[PDB]
From a paper:
The assembly of [name] protein into amyloid filaments through templated seeding is believed to underlie the propagation of pathology in neurodegenerative diseases, such as Alzheimer’s disease (AD) and other tauopathies. In the brains of individuals with AD, a 3R + 4R tauopathy, two types of filaments are present: abundant paired helical filaments (PHFs) and rarer straight filaments (SFs). The C-shaped core of each protofilament, that is, the Alzheimer's [name] fold, comprises amino acids V306–F378 (based on the numbering of the longest 441-amino acid [name] isoform). Here, we describe a [name] seeding biosensor model in human embryonic kidney 293T (HEK293T) cells that stably overexpresses a hemagglutinin (HA)-tagged region of 4R human [name] spanning residues K297–E391 (HA-tau297–391).
We then used cryo-EM to determine the structure of HA-tau297–391 filaments extracted from the AD-seeded biosensor cells. Most isolated filaments consisted of two protofilaments with an approximate crossover distance of 900 Å. Using helical reconstruction in RELION, we obtained a reconstruction at 3.6 Å resolution. The structures consisted of two identical C-shaped protofilaments that adopted a “head-to-head” orientation with C2 helical symmetry. The ordered core of each protofilament comprised residues G304–R379 that were arranged into eight β-strands and was almost identical (with an estimated all-atom RMSD of 1.3 Å) to the Alzheimer's [name] fold of PHFs and SFs. A similar head-to-head interaction between two protofilaments with the Alzheimer's fold has previously been described for an intermediate polymorph in the in vitro assembly of recombinant tau297–391 [name] into PHFs. As in PHFs from human brains, the reconstruction of HA-tau297–391-seeded filaments showed additional densities in front of residues K317 and K321, as well as inside the C-shaped protofilament, close to residues H362 and K369 (dark and light blue arrows, respectively). However, in contrast to PHFs from the human brain, reconstruction of the seeded aggregates also showed an additional density in front of residues H329 and K331 (orange arrow). Whereas the protofilament interface in PHFs is formed by the antiparallel stacking of residues 332PGGGQ336, with K331 orienting toward E338 on the opposite protofilament, the protofilaments in the “head-to-head” structure formed an electrostatic interaction between residues E342 and K343. It is therefore possible that the additional density in front of K331 prevented the formation of PHFs.
Numbering used by the authors:
A (entry chain G), B (entry chain B), C (entry chain D), D (entry chain C), E (entry chain A), F (entry chain E): 304 to 379
Write the structure that this text describes.
């Protein structure tokens, strides 16, 4: 026997923003506090952690648009 | 026997925003507090964690539109 | 037998922003505090951590748009 | 008023043993095994403990007789 | 008022053993094993402990006789 | 007022052993093994400990007899 695989996907796709102005943005949080206590940490085989992380962010992109795309073909 | 597979999807798509202005934005919270107590942490084989994370975000994109897409073909 | 694979994906795609002006942005947080205590840490085989990290960010790109794309073909 | 207290207990006591011989004494046990696992011990204000104590005693006194005695008087 | 306390206890007491001979004694235990695992020990304010104590004793006194005695008087 | 205390305890007491001979004593144990693991030890305010102690004793006194005696008087 025999096999033909033809794979021809098309995007004419668009992702877009139009905006006049980003105005006035004030970010004024009051002062926080964090405390943590433990005795042992013991991590094995593919581990992530975050411990004790007081964190303030202002993020004002003039458009933050995106496209995420994937293709897979597998044959056996 | 024999096989033909003909994969031809098409996107002519638009994802869009139009906006006048972002005005006046105030992010003005009072101060928080966090406390955590433990004795042992013992993590094995593909783990995530977060412990004690007082966290303030202002996020004001001039449009934050997205398209998320995948294609897969599998043959045996 | 015999096999033919014809892989020809196409993008004429666009990811885009238009914006007039980024205005006035004030990032004016009060002062924080963080404390952490432990006695042993023991990490093995593919580990990340962050411990005790007071953190302030302003991020104002004049457009922060992106495209993420992947292709895979595998044959056995 | 007035008080007289006249405390005069008497012991003419004997505690005694008489014995011929202690013969032949064999203490011949097979070997044991002990295992213990824990993580934390945290002791406060007047504590005793024993952990993991495989223990063989032969105790062959030629008489182990005893007298245990107390006297108390209290006045207010 | 007035108080007289008279305290005149008497012992003509005896504690005794008589024995011919202590014979043949064979303390012959097989060899043992002990194992203990933990992570933290934390002791405060009047503490005793023993951990992991493989122990063998032969005690053969030619008489182990005793008297324990106490007296107390208290006045307020 | 007035107070008189007349404390006159008496012992004509004896503690004794008589024994002919202490015979033949063999203390012939097989070989032991001990293992202990931990990570932190933290002791405060009047503490004793023993950790990991393989121990063999022979004790053969020609009589080990004893007398323990105490007296207390207290006045306020």
């Amino acid at each position: 026997g025999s096999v033909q695989i033809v794979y021809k996907p098309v995007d004419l796709s668009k992702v877009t923003s139009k905006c006049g102005s980003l105005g006035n943005i004030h970010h004024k949080p009051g002062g926080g506090q964090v405390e943590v206590k433990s005795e042992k940490l013991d991590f094995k085989d593919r581990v992530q952690s975050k411990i004790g992380s007081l964190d303030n962010i202002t993020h004002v992109p003039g458009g933050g648009n995106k496209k995420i795309e994937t293709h897979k073909l597998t044959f056996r």
